Amino acid sequence: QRWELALGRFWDYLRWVQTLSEQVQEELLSSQVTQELRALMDETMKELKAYKSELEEQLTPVAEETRARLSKELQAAQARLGADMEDVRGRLVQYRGEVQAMLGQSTEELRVRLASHLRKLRKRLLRDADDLQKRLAVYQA
Ligand SMILES: N=C(N)C1(c2cccc(Cl)c2)CCC1
């Protein structure tokens, strides 16, 4: 699906950031990483919204209160994914500021802690994406 390809581009970019390789460390001190992640996030959410809209052209008819609940649950799962991606962006903005405040000192232990926290944020984003995919897969029925 288009939205899954978009999310995959976000996910591959963030897997690269997770390596904290030399070029990642460079781009993390500019706005480049968080700006490129915002663009990838925005594209994912836009495709998600269009996909839901197109699914609603091919629904199995059910009771109005049942359809309304399923649409609400799907809306909340979309919001969770967007919030996860923002949490990742925000944590990398925080890293930038904490490095500046070190005034040139070693960032090795900042990066160890960032790597650890990024792993947890990414586990959360992955489980929310899998839950959203499952909900979309049964939505039309
Ligand atoms: N095949 C998957 N598990 C999906 C996926 C793909 C890439 C990255 C992520 Cl986080 C999730 C597609 C929606 C769930």
From Swiss-Prot:
Question: What outcome follows a substitution of L5P?
Answer: Found in a patient with hypercholesterolemia; uncertain significance; ApoE4 Freiburg
Positions carrying Methionine sulfoxide: M102
Q: Note the effect listed for D131A.
A: Restores the LDL receptor binding activity of ApoE2
Where are the annotated glycans? Answer: K52
Transmembrane feature ranges? none
Localization in the cell: Secreted; Secreted, Extracellular space; Secreted, Extracellular space, Extracellular matrix; Extracellular vesicle
Where do the sequence repeat units fall? 39-60, 61-82, 83-104, 105-126
What is the recorded phenotype of mutating A129P?
In ApoE3*; decreased binding to LDL receptor
Positions of post-translational Phosphoserine modification: S106
Impact of mutating R122P? In LPG; ApoE2 Sendai; decreased binding to LDL receptor; induces intraglomerular deposition of ApoE-containing lipoproteins
The impact of changing R122C is: In HLPP3; also found in a patient with hypercholesterolemia; ApoE4 Philadelphia and ApoE2-type
Q: In which tissues is it expressed?
A: Produced by several tissues and cell types and mainly found associated with lipid particles in the plasma, the interstitial fluid and lymph. Mainly synthesized by liver hepatocytes. Significant quantities are also produced in brain, mainly by astrocytes and glial cells in the cerebral cortex, but also by neurons in frontal cortex and hippocampus. It is also expressed by cells of the peripheral nervous system. Also expressed by adrenal gland, testis, ovary, skin, kidney, spleen and adipose tissue and macrophages in various tissues.
Subunit composition and interactions? Homotetramer. May interact with ABCA1; functionally associated with ABCA1 in the biogenesis of HDLs. May interact with APP/A4 amyloid-beta peptide; the interaction is extremely stable in vitro but its physiological significance is unclear. May interact with MAPT. May interact with MAP2. In the cerebrospinal fluid, interacts with secreted SORL1. Interacts with PMEL; this allows the loading of PMEL luminal fragment on ILVs to induce fibril nucleation. (Microbial infection) Interacts with hepatitis C virus (HCV) envelope glycoprotein E2; this interaction is required for HCV infectivity and production.
Q: What does this protein do?
A: APOE is an apolipoprotein, a protein associating with lipid particles, that mainly functions in lipoprotein-mediated lipid transport between organs via the plasma and interstitial fluids. APOE is a core component of plasma lipoproteins and is involved in their production, conversion and clearance. Apolipoproteins are amphipathic molecules that interact both with lipids of the lipoprotein particle core and the aqueous environment of the plasma.
Give the family, as the similarity comment puts it: Belongs to the apolipoprotein A1/A4/E family.
**Which named protein is this?**
Apolipoprotein E
Q: What is the name of the gene encoding this protein? A: APOE
Tell which residues of the whole protein are contained here: 42 to 180 of 317
